[PDB]
């Protein structure tokens, strides 16, 4: 809607042209689960 | 760095011993060391810098303030200490301050040393230069602290400084740095950012210090250094106060308890409140690990008094019942009332299972209590501390300090010990009974004050040093920094928080009104302090919540602001008929631009006040066809001031016939001709016109008013298309006065006609700007093409020729900063449309504005008188 106004022609291209399918998305998920401990945890450390 | 050293001491029997200087350990040895740990390894961590103060140089500094004494102060090592001293330690320390940011985890250390060098800033046998080294050390120290860490060194300096002897020189500047950096840390709610926010007593603190320091030099005489001095220490501790703030040497004077009886009645409490803090006490040792046992053993955790209350003999008993009648003394003492109201709500051997007292919860009214009690529990240590000492000869002791300057943890022991008492008399049953205040409040009030005791003082004719040296600075400060608290409204809030009260607003409108009535007819009478006299009225009429008083007040200030009005009206038609021309236009001028602005024109401008705006309308437009030098000198500041008071007017004067319409009206509760004659003359002389001469009292007065008057009377309809010719006529009269070489007016015009130009219509783009936009590029044309064909001669004789342009261009560097300011605001409101459809105009003069950036662009002539004229006009 405003890509004419302000941005066409200063050089600014749309993020998605001359592309053939729709960009994939990802999202945060709020479930926990199971991680291994970082090697490098500012707080814990394990030792075998 | 770290060996010991050998300090003077007295014998106690003869004269005191002192070492051999020519046989032993000087710290002229220690300088050396000092001087190479300096240059060659530095120091970079902080870490390490705190070893070495730990280690290396507190000692020293704790010897040397120790040897201040008088009996030591003059004797050799003491001199040798000062001197190595202030020659290497401290310049060290000094360089190295920025590294104490963040050095929360060591702030018993730092408090330390703050301490010791404050001292040493106090010896009696220093030079001048040691004197000024150790007080640069402290105020580079101070810097960089966190503002929560200087809590101490502010308790020392509130002692100190309210004396004004001839030491507090220095203290003074060091509190004016403080405050002036940390004004956020005691000002907004949020606080700095990382740094928190403050807490109740440092805020305590800070209001004693500004009243003791105001107090005590309001009878001081007169001294310019010491005013100089106080008076940037007393604006900043004002400025870094919140304004509703409300607050919550040591001669300890408990209340006498020694002759009260305390009734037999209270025996039953005494003895059970005893046995309950036994079974405390008890529980508290038996649950870590503590048992019975002949002797008190810290080791084996033995001790014999853990055993039932009821094995203690009568007399033993007075261990815990003489800490609680004393209590309960000191509460009748205070005339108190204590009525029981209510009833009376695993290890080997002893198990005392006292009741838990957390769950007991304290009104507002009894932790007040508790609080006094507590003070008093301080105060009895503290009298009998102090006559120890006094008998023993004893030292000091920290806590040998008021109550009210100790911390919320400070206070604890005490406080809970109070609480603990107030907590088990109501557990029992027991019902016990004792039986404004804004910053801003007070410091109105004495502001009042002092002006009804300078008016007096003005009628007669040290205190009229004190006022104009003093308080006109203090109000011109405190005000500007706090005018939007004072705005603020409980229905629409506009600083960071809280209002003030209407109690405060109408204090400040009389004390505006009040130096408005004592500043009349007497400019001259206060000389050289004329002038800021003045800009504090502009400070307090850019204050005024007009709308507030008028709507619900006293009638002594709405009848004092009337009376203001009227005079102002009675001076201007004086006038008209040497100190109307410098201070009421101004004042009057920024009064009515902060009432049209904040739209309080309905509300405060009715009644006598319509007729006193009428007749200064009538007198101000009465000069007409006068002509004579004052007025072609007093012309604009009349313009500015009719444009504002048209602004603020809430009738539309200038048309009569609808009148009737208009319910703020007085005639629903003569000369000026009609906006269509008006108009018609403005019209008619655009046309065959051209001169500014002949014509002044239009351009420089009727403008100013019509472009004032259109836009407020626009939103409640007058049209649209009284605007499009009023701008085409504008800049049709700004285009006919192109040649003209004193043209100054025009810079003030193009002010005058911006708001106009945001209801302009499309069609001005053709018929106006291209004309005025073609005619100004020919004359550059023209100019550049002169300037090209002298240049080319580049003889000697161009120096006759130089001059020559380098005047017409500066008349052109005039006549576009007319224009251009006007027409940058136009394509802002239409740019986008000119982008959605073609248009050949915008094209056009898109060619012509390149045109006239490249021609500007090629000489640097150009940009030098551009300059110049920007650097000249102070222009934005």
């Known amino acids: 809607r405003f890509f004419a106004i302000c941005g066409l022609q200063e050089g600014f291209e749309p993020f998605a042209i001359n592309m053939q399918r729709p960009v994939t998305t990802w999202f945060s998920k709020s479930l926990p689960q199971f991680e291994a401990v970082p090697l490098e945890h500012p707080h814990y450390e394990v030792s075998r | ?876």
């Open chain 2, 1 to 876: 760095i770290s060996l010991p050293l050998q300090i003077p001491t007295l014998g106690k029997d003869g004269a005191l011993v002192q070492p051999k200087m020519s046989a032993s350990f000087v710290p002229d040895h220690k300088a050396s060391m000092v001087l190479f740990l300096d240059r060659v390894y530095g120091i970079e961590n902080q870490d390490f810098l705190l070893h070495v103060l730990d280690v290396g140089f507190l000692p020293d500094m704790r010897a040397a303030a120790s040897l201040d004494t008088a009996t030591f102060s003059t004797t050799e090592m003491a001199l040798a200490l000062n001197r190595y001293l202030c020659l290497a330690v401290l310049p060290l320390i000094t360089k190295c301050a920025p590294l104490f940011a963040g050095t929360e985890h060591r702030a018993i250390m730092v408090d330390s040393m703050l301490h010791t060098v404050y001292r040493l800033s106090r010896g009696r046998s220093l030079t001048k230069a040691q004197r000024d080294v150790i007080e640069e050390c402290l105020m580079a120290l101070c810097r960089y602290i966190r503002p929560s860490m200087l809590q101490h060194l502010l308790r020392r300096l509130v002692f100190d400084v309210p004396i004004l002897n001839e030491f507090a020189k220095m203290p003074l500047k060091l509190l004016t740095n403080h405050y002036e950096r940390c004004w956020k840390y005691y000002c907004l709610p949020t606080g700095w950012a990382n740094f928190g926010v403050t807490s109740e007593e440092e805020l305590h603190l800070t209001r004693k210090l500004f009243w003791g320091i105001f107090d005590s030099l309001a009878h001081k005489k007169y001294d310019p250094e010491l005013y100089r001095m106080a008076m940037p220490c007393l604006c900043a501790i004002a400025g870094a106060l919140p304004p509703d703030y409300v607050d919550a040497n040591f001669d300890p004077r408990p209340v006498e308890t020694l002759n009260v009886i305390i009734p037999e009645k209270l025996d039953s409490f005494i003895n059970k409140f005893a046995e309950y803090t036994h079974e405390k006490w008890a529980f508290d040792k038996i649950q870590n690990n503590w048992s019975y046992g002949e002797n008190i053993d810290e080791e084996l955790k033995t001790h014999p008094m853990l055993r039932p209350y009821k094995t203690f003999s009568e007399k033993d008993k007075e261990i815990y019942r003489w800490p609680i009648k004393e209590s309960l003394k000191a509460m009748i003492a205070w005339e108190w009332t204590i009525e029981k109201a209510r009833e009376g709500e695993a290890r080997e051997g002893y198990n005392p299972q006292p009741p838990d007292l957390s769950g007991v919860t304290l009104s507002r009214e009894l932790q007040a209590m508790a609080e006094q009690l507590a003070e008093n529990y301080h105060n009895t240590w503290g009298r009998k501390k102090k006559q120890e000492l006094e008998a023993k000869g004893g030292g000091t002791h920290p806590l040998l300090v008021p109550y009210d300057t100790l911390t919320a943890k400070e206070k604890a022991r005490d406080r809970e010990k109070a609480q603990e008492l107030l907590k088990f008399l109501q557990m029992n049953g027991y019902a016990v009974t004792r039986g404004e205040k804004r910053f801003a409040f007070g410091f109105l009030q004495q502001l009042l004050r002092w002006m009804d005791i300078s008016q007096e003082f003005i009628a007669h004719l040290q205190e009229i040093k004190f006022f104009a040296k003093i308080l006109l600075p203090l109000i011109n400060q405190y005000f500007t920094n706090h005018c939007l608290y004072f705005l603020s409204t409980p229905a629409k809030v506009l600083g960071s928080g809280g209002h003030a009260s209407n109690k405060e607003k109408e204090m400040i409108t009389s004390l505006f009104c009040k130096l408005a009535a004592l500043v009349r007819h007497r400019v001259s009478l206060f000389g050289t302090d004329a002038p800021a006299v003045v800009n504090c009225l502009h400070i307090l009429a850019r204050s005024l919540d007009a709308r507030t008083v008028m709507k619900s007040g006293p009638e002594i200030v709405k009848a004092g602001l009337r009376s203001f009005f009227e005079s102002a009206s009675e001076d201007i038609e004086k006038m008209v008929e040497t100190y109307t021309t410098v201070a009421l236009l101004p004042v009057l001028t920024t009064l009515f631009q902060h009432i049209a602005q904040h739209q309080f024109g309905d509300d405060v401008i009715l009644d006598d006040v319509q007729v006193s705006c009428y007749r200064t309308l009538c007198s101000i437009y009465s000069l007409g066809t006068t002509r004579n030098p004052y007025v072609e000198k007093l012309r604009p500041a009349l313009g500015e001031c009719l444009a504002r008071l048209a602004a603020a007017m809430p009738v539309a004067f200038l048309e009569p016939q609808l009148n009737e319409y208009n319910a703020c009206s007085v005639y629903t509760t003569p000369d000026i001709p009609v906006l269509e004659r008006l108009m018609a003359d403005i019209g008619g002389l655009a046309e065959s016109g051209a001169r500014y001469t002949e014509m002044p009292h239009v351009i420089e007065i009727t403008l100013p008013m019509l472009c004032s008057y259109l836009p407020r009377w626009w939103e409640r309809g007058v049209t649209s298309d009284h605007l499009n010719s009023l701008l085409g006529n504008i800049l049709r009269i700004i285009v006919n006065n192109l040649g003209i070489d004193e043209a100054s007016w025009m810079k003030r015009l193009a002010v005058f006609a911006q708001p106009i130009v945001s209801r302009a219509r499309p069609e001005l783009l053709h018929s106006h700007f291209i004309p005025t936009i073609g005619r100004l590029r020919k004359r550059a044309g023209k100019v550049v093409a002169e300037e090209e064909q002298l240049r080319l001669e580049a003889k000697a004789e161009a120096e006759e020729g130089e001059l020559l342009v380098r005047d017409e261009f500066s008349v052109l560097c005039r006549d576009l900063y007319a224009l251009y300011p006007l027409l940058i605001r136009y394509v802002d409101n239409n740019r986008a449309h000119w982008l959605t459809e073609p248009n050949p105009s915008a094209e056009e003069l898109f060619r012509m504005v390149g045109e006239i950036f490249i021609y500007w662009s090629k000489s640097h002539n150009f940009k030098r008188e551009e300059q110049n004229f920007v650097v000249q006009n102070e222009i934005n």
